[PDB]
Short mmCIF file of C-alpha atoms and ligand atoms in Angstrom, two decimals:
data_model
loop_
_atom_site.label_atom_id
_atom_site.label_comp_id
_atom_site.label_asym_id
_atom_site.label_seq_id
_atom_site.Cartn_x
_atom_site.Cartn_y
_atom_site.Cartn_z
CA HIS A 11 -3.34 -2.15 -11.93
CA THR A 12 -1.56 0.74 -10.05
CA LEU A 13 1.00 2.44 -9.31
CA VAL A 14 2.38 4.92 -7.01
CA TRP A 15 3.49 8.52 -8.79
CA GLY A 16 4.72 10.19 -5.29
CA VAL A 17 3.72 11.91 -2.12
CA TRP A 18 2.53 14.31 -0.21
CA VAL A 19 3.73 16.14 2.91
CA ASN A 20 1.26 18.32 5.32
CA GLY A 21 -0.86 19.46 2.10
CA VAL A 22 2.75 19.67 -0.14
CA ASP A 23 3.28 17.39 -3.52
CA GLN A 24 6.78 16.68 -3.41
CA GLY A 25 6.60 16.30 -6.69
CA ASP A 26 6.64 12.95 -8.61
CA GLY A 27 9.17 10.02 -7.02
CA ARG A 28 8.96 7.67 -9.71
CA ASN A 29 12.04 5.64 -9.10
CA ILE A 30 13.35 8.59 -6.76
CA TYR A 31 12.13 8.10 -3.90
CA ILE A 32 9.74 5.32 -4.57
CA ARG A 33 11.63 1.94 -5.45
CA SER A 34 9.00 1.49 -8.69
CA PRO A 35 8.67 -1.47 -10.73
CA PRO A 36 7.93 -0.70 -14.41
CA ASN A 37 4.76 -1.11 -14.09
CA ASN A 38 1.13 -1.81 -12.89
CA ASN A 39 0.95 -6.14 -12.96
CA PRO A 40 0.20 -7.16 -9.81
CA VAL A 41 2.30 -9.67 -7.22
CA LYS A 42 -0.43 -12.51 -5.82
CA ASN A 43 2.87 -14.95 -5.62
CA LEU A 44 2.55 -14.99 -1.76
CA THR A 45 5.94 -16.30 -0.77
CA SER A 46 7.94 -14.42 -3.21
CA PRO A 47 10.56 -11.71 -1.73
CA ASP A 48 8.74 -9.12 -4.66
CA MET A 49 6.23 -9.53 -1.64
CA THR A 50 8.06 -7.12 0.06
CA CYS A 51 8.53 -3.92 -2.19
CA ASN A 52 7.28 -5.01 -5.90
CA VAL A 53 9.58 -6.42 -8.84
CA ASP A 54 12.43 -4.58 -8.67
CA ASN A 55 13.63 -3.77 -5.16
CA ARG A 56 16.96 -1.42 -4.86
CA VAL A 57 17.84 1.80 -2.96
CA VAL A 58 17.22 4.71 -5.55
CA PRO A 59 18.23 8.14 -4.75
CA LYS A 60 16.02 9.70 -2.37
CA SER A 61 14.09 9.78 0.49
CA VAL A 62 11.82 12.57 1.44
CA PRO A 63 11.91 14.26 4.66
CA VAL A 64 8.96 14.68 7.38
CA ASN A 65 8.79 14.54 11.26
CA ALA A 66 7.30 13.04 13.61
CA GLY A 67 3.12 14.21 13.70
CA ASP A 68 3.52 14.93 9.97
CA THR A 69 1.07 13.59 7.35
CA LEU A 70 2.53 11.91 4.95
CA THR A 71 -0.10 10.91 1.73
CA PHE A 72 0.53 8.10 -0.85
CA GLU A 73 -0.99 8.96 -4.09
CA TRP A 74 -1.75 5.95 -7.34
CA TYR A 75 -2.68 6.15 -9.94
CA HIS A 76 -3.62 3.47 -13.12
CA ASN A 77 -2.14 5.44 -16.41
CA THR A 78 -1.66 8.25 -15.61
CA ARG A 79 -1.80 11.41 -12.98
CA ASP A 80 -4.89 11.74 -11.44
CA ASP A 81 -6.91 9.48 -13.80
CA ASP A 82 -9.08 6.48 -12.88
CA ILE A 83 -6.74 5.56 -10.56
CA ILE A 84 -7.09 1.25 -10.38
CA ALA A 85 -10.25 -0.38 -11.95
CA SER A 86 -12.65 -0.44 -9.98
CA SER A 87 -13.36 -4.00 -10.01
CA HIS A 88 -10.39 -4.08 -7.94
CA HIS A 89 -12.16 -4.19 -4.33
CA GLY A 90 -10.47 -4.41 -1.54
CA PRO A 91 -8.53 -2.92 1.69
CA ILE A 92 -5.18 -0.92 2.19
CA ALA A 93 -2.33 -1.28 5.10
CA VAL A 94 0.37 1.14 5.68
CA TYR A 95 3.43 -0.29 7.17
CA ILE A 96 6.73 0.62 8.06
CA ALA A 97 9.72 -0.60 8.59
CA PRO A 98 14.36 0.39 9.06
CA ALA A 99 16.09 1.24 6.54
CA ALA A 100 18.41 -0.38 7.78
CA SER A 101 16.33 -3.79 6.98
CA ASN A 102 15.51 -3.77 3.52
CA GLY A 103 12.64 -4.64 3.87
CA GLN A 104 13.77 -8.35 4.98
CA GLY A 105 13.04 -10.36 9.17
CA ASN A 106 10.91 -9.45 10.91
CA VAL A 107 10.37 -5.41 10.58
CA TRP A 108 6.98 -4.53 9.63
CA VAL A 109 5.28 -3.10 11.77
CA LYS A 110 1.40 -1.33 10.63
CA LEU A 111 0.19 2.24 11.01
CA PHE A 112 -2.67 1.81 9.19
CA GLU A 113 -5.60 -0.43 7.68
CA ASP A 114 -8.86 0.11 5.70
CA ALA A 115 -11.18 -2.45 4.42
CA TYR A 116 -14.42 -2.02 3.95
CA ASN A 117 -16.80 0.46 6.23
CA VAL A 118 -20.65 -0.60 6.18
CA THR A 119 -21.79 3.22 6.63
CA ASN A 120 -20.95 4.29 3.27
CA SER A 121 -21.08 0.65 2.03
CA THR A 122 -17.53 1.19 0.26
CA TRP A 123 -14.37 -0.91 0.20
CA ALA A 124 -11.34 1.78 0.40
CA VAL A 125 -10.19 0.94 -3.21
CA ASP A 126 -13.80 2.26 -4.02
CA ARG A 127 -12.86 5.22 -1.40
CA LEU A 128 -9.28 6.30 -3.53
CA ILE A 129 -10.53 5.83 -6.87
CA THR A 130 -12.79 9.46 -5.37
CA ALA A 131 -9.74 10.31 -3.32
CA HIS A 132 -7.79 10.73 -6.79
CA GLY A 133 -6.20 7.53 -5.32
CA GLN A 134 -4.55 9.48 -1.96
CA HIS A 135 -4.52 8.31 1.21
CA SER A 136 -2.62 8.82 3.86
CA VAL A 137 -0.69 8.34 7.41
CA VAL A 138 1.01 9.97 10.46
CA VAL A 139 4.48 9.77 10.76
CA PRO A 140 4.68 8.56 14.29
CA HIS A 141 7.25 9.16 16.63
CA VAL A 142 10.09 6.74 16.85
CA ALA A 143 13.45 7.38 15.81
CA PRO A 144 15.07 9.68 13.80
CA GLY A 145 16.56 7.71 10.87
CA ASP A 146 16.15 6.20 8.01
CA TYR A 147 12.23 4.19 6.35
CA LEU A 148 10.79 2.18 4.51
CA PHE A 149 6.69 2.88 3.91
CA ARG A 150 5.52 0.11 2.39
CA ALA A 151 1.81 1.16 0.39
CA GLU A 152 -0.32 -1.98 -0.55
CA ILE A 153 -3.74 -1.94 -1.72
CA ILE A 154 -4.76 -6.03 -1.87
CA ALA A 155 -7.84 -6.09 -5.25
CA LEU A 156 -10.51 -9.26 -4.16
CA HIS A 157 -11.91 -9.84 -7.59
CA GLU A 158 -10.34 -12.68 -7.90
CA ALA A 159 -9.09 -13.83 -4.80
CA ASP A 160 -11.88 -16.61 -4.14
CA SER A 161 -8.77 -19.06 -5.54
CA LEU A 162 -5.23 -19.00 -4.20
CA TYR A 163 -2.71 -18.41 -6.80
CA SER A 164 -0.77 -21.20 -4.73
CA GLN A 165 -3.07 -23.60 -5.82
CA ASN A 166 -4.28 -21.66 -9.55
CA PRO A 167 -2.03 -19.18 -10.82
CA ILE A 168 -3.64 -18.70 -13.50
CA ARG A 169 -6.05 -16.20 -9.70
CA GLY A 170 -5.05 -15.02 -6.42
CA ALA A 171 -5.27 -11.91 -4.23
CA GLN A 172 -3.65 -9.47 -6.30
CA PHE A 173 -1.00 -7.23 -3.82
CA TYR A 174 0.07 -3.18 -5.12
CA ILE A 175 2.69 -2.43 -3.41
CA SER A 176 4.96 0.27 -3.13
CA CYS A 177 7.92 1.59 -1.05
CA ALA A 178 8.84 5.45 0.20
CA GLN A 179 12.27 5.85 1.42
CA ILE A 180 10.58 8.78 3.83
CA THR A 181 14.17 10.00 6.72
CA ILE A 182 12.22 11.00 9.57
CA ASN A 183 14.14 13.80 11.00
CA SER A 184 12.29 15.88 14.40
CA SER A 185 11.51 13.54 16.51
CA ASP A 186 11.11 12.55 20.13
CA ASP A 187 10.94 8.93 19.99
CA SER A 188 8.83 8.69 21.79
CA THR A 189 6.61 4.71 20.80
CA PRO A 190 10.71 2.67 19.64
CA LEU A 191 9.32 1.31 16.80
CA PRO A 192 8.22 -2.51 18.12
CA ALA A 193 8.38 -5.79 16.07
CA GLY A 194 7.16 -6.58 12.73
CA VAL A 195 6.40 -8.74 10.78
CA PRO A 196 7.43 -10.46 7.43
CA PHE A 197 7.16 -9.65 3.85
CA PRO A 198 7.50 -12.38 2.30
CA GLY A 199 5.52 -14.30 5.65
CA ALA A 200 3.21 -12.97 7.15
CA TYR A 201 0.13 -13.29 4.57
CA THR A 202 -0.92 -16.72 4.05
CA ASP A 203 -3.41 -19.50 2.56
CA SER A 204 -5.10 -19.97 5.24
CA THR A 205 -4.23 -15.70 6.68
CA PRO A 206 -7.41 -14.45 6.81
CA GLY A 207 -8.87 -12.07 3.87
CA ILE A 208 -6.75 -13.59 1.38
CA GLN A 209 -8.79 -15.81 0.27
CA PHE A 210 -12.49 -13.88 -0.19
CA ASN A 211 -15.35 -14.32 -2.05
CA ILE A 212 -16.42 -10.63 -2.81
CA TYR A 213 -19.00 -11.78 -4.46
CA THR A 214 -21.18 -14.05 -2.78
CA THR A 215 -19.77 -13.13 1.23
CA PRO A 216 -21.63 -9.96 2.64
CA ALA A 217 -18.33 -7.63 3.09
CA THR A 218 -19.16 -6.87 6.17
CA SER A 219 -18.09 -10.50 6.91
CA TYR A 220 -15.08 -9.13 6.11
CA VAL A 221 -11.72 -9.74 7.55
CA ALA A 222 -7.97 -7.97 6.96
CA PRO A 223 -4.80 -9.83 7.10
CA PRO A 224 -3.29 -8.70 10.72
CA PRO A 225 -1.22 -8.27 11.79
CA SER A 226 -3.36 -5.40 13.47
CA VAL A 227 -2.84 -1.72 12.98
CA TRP A 228 0.63 -0.75 15.67
CA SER A 229 -0.59 0.77 19.02
CA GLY A 230 2.12 3.67 18.34
CA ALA A 231 0.51 4.47 15.32
CA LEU A 232 -0.23 8.01 15.08
CA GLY A 233 -4.12 7.93 12.88
CA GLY A 234 -4.48 7.90 8.99
CA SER A 235 -7.34 8.34 6.37
CA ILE A 236 -8.02 7.78 3.31
CA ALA A 237 -9.37 11.30 1.30
CA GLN A 238 -7.71 13.90 -1.29
CA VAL A 239 -5.07 16.20 0.57
CA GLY A 240 -4.37 17.96 -2.39
CA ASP A 241 -5.08 18.75 -6.29
CA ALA A 242 -2.76 17.31 -8.58
CA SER A 243 -4.37 19.30 -11.60
CA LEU A 244 -3.30 22.70 -10.30
CA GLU A 245 0.22 21.03 -10.28
O1 LIG B 405 -8.92 -10.32 -17.02
C1 LIG B 405 -10.18 -9.83 -16.56
C2 LIG B 405 -9.94 -8.56 -15.39
O2 LIG B 405 -9.25 -7.83 -15.98
C3 LIG B 405 -8.75 -6.41 -14.53
O3 LIG B 405 -8.67 -5.58 -16.27
C4 LIG B 405 -7.10 -5.80 -15.87
C5 LIG B 405 -7.32 -6.54 -16.95
O4 LIG B 405 -7.32 -7.62 -16.71
C6 LIG B 405 -5.25 -6.22 -17.64
O5 LIG B 405 -4.54 -7.05 -18.31
C7 LIG B 405 -4.87 -4.51 -17.43
O6 LIG B 405 -3.28 -4.45 -17.51
C8 LIG B 405 -3.09 -3.57 -18.02
C9 LIG B 405 -3.09 -1.91 -17.65
O7 LIG B 405 -4.48 -1.31 -16.86
C10 LIG B 405 -2.50 -0.42 -17.94
O8 LIG B 405 -2.08 0.76 -16.90
C11 LIG B 405 -1.44 -1.17 -18.53
O9 LIG B 405 -1.19 -0.22 -19.91
O10 LIG B 405 -1.65 -2.68 -19.91
C12 LIG B 405 -1.89 -3.02 -18.71
C13 LIG B 405 -2.07 -4.80 -20.02
O11 LIG B 405 -0.85 -5.20 -20.18
O12 LIG B 405 -5.06 -4.04 -16.91
C14 LIG B 405 -7.07 -4.05 -15.18
C15 LIG B 405 -7.33 -3.38 -14.83
O13 LIG B 405 -6.56 -1.73 -14.78
C16 LIG B 405 -10.47 -6.24 -14.72
O14 LIG B 405 -10.37 -5.31 -13.49
C17 LIG B 405 -11.49 -7.72 -14.37
O15 LIG B 405 -12.93 -7.01 -13.78
C18 LIG B 405 -11.16 -8.93 -14.99
O16 LIG B 405 -12.20 -10.09 -15.09
C1 NAG B 406 6.36 -18.51 -6.32
O1 NAG B 406 7.42 -17.30 -5.16
C2 NAG B 406 8.13 -18.39 -4.66
C3 NAG B 406 10.04 -17.67 -4.29
O2 NAG B 406 10.11 -16.88 -4.61
C4 NAG B 406 8.99 -19.12 -6.15
O3 NAG B 406 9.95 -20.55 -5.93
C5 NAG B 406 7.86 -20.05 -6.55
O4 NAG B 406 8.64 -19.97 -8.24
C6 NAG B 406 7.15 -18.59 -6.97
N1 NAG B 406 5.80 -19.39 -7.35
C7 NAG B 406 5.71 -19.04 -8.55
C8 NAG B 406 4.87 -19.98 -9.34
O5 NAG B 406 6.17 -18.47 -9.97
CL1 CL B 407 -6.58 -6.56 -12.76
CL1 CL B 408 6.60 -6.85 -17.03
CL1 CL B 409 3.35 -12.58 -8.68
CL1 CL B 410 13.95 -10.92 -7.12
CL1 CL B 411 18.14 12.30 -0.16
CL1 CL B 412 1.69 10.96 -15.38
CL1 CL B 413 -11.52 12.37 -1.38
CL1 CL B 414 8.49 14.48 18.29
CL1 CL B 415 3.72 -13.31 10.62
CL1 CL B 416 -5.04 11.06 7.44
CU1 CU B 417 -5.71 -4.77 -11.73
#
């Protein structure tokens, strides 16, 4: 159970974005139904009044939290990967529009899942804004908690992989459009019951065998990291 509080741009806090520039759901409950429209931008997908201005090459940092800002972030039970996707805002996340900018599953040298590292990073993870067409975009941050993912939701609706999905409204202002945005995948639709990474047993299968759900990260993506960039406590 986790939610996005807001974002930072180039290490600068853009302020509380809940229902402002984040299409926030009413609570931190997971989405589990892979076929539901809730997969796109969670359960209250609507236009919110603000969209955060950034330029290509900026660092955009999502900040997550559990109950209050900079708290335990997400229960440490919730081991799993983290991905960020982008689509143009005009799609409203419909269609084959979602392009992967970032993927982190398990780090063998540190022996930590992306979620493990997100807690250490005080809820913060980032992507570098790509050289896509200027315009309005949705950035869809997705955490998959795998602690009940030995079952499939479709088969047993009290279990299954859990998706903590948050869509940020982001306006790319300065960009040369030198890496125009390629074809995307649909959410819902990209993840199905046979998709690698959706059904997995973290308690018996080595984490080093884990493979995250495709698609693979776009070659045009400029980078990203799970790491604290700013200190909320001074805010
Ligand atoms: O059910 C067994 C699993 O529980 C996991 O904990 C979650 C609880 O199941 C869930 O009810 C609780 O939801 C809270 C939420 O955390 C809180 O922020 C919100 O205000 O109220 C919700 C309840 O209405 O979330 C916790 C996770 O934080 C365990 O992590 C898991 O190991 C366990 O097997
Ligand atoms: C999953 O979502 C689909 C599409 O909205 C819906 O028909 C189905 O009823 C959902 N499953 C459950 C258990 O709610
Ligand atoms: Cl949970
Ligand atoms: Cl609810
Ligand atoms: Cl659901
Ligand atoms: Cl709906
Ligand atoms: Cl605005
Ligand atoms: Cl808060
Ligand atoms: Cl960190
Ligand atoms: Cl540029
Ligand atoms: Cl697909
Ligand atoms: Cl980064
Ligand atoms: Cu939870």
